[PDB]
């Protein structure tokens, strides 16, 4: 991958160091998941903590963000359209996506 806010070389602590000493809730980036290998994590700052949402790549190249058990399966044909959705308030996250931390 290719997008500016996707960091691939990036530990959890490193990302938390870059998200928290950012300032505003709404700081976000994408990184590789450490728990589910091959998955991604949308990470955003909110209330002095990072909130991570795993992203699964599926069969035909879809991106499937982890939704809870009472929320419809929500998939995106690419990654910028997933980030485009969560830039809008009240979409299911703890805070919407405001400030991209670039690599």
């Amino acid at each position: 991958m290719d997008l500016p806010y996707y960091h691939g070389c990036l530990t959890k602590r490193e990302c938390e160091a870059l998200l928290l000493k950012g300032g505003v809730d709404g700081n976000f980036l994408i990184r590789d998941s450490e728990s589910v290998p091959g998955a991604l994590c949308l990470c955003v700052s909110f209330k002095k903590l990072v909130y991570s949402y795993r992203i699964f790549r599926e069969k035909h190249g879809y991106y499937r963000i982890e939704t809870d058990a009472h929320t419809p399966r929500t998939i995106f044909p690419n990654l910028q359209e997933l980030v485009s959705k969560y830039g809008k308030p009240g979409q299911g996250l703890v805070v919407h996506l405001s400030n991209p931390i670039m690599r």
Binding site: L49, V50, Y51, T71
Partner: peptide
């Protein structure tokens, strides 16, 4: 850690 894992809710 200082990361909370969460799921989308809408």
């Amino acid at each position: 850690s200082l990361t909370i894992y969460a799921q989308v809710q809408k």
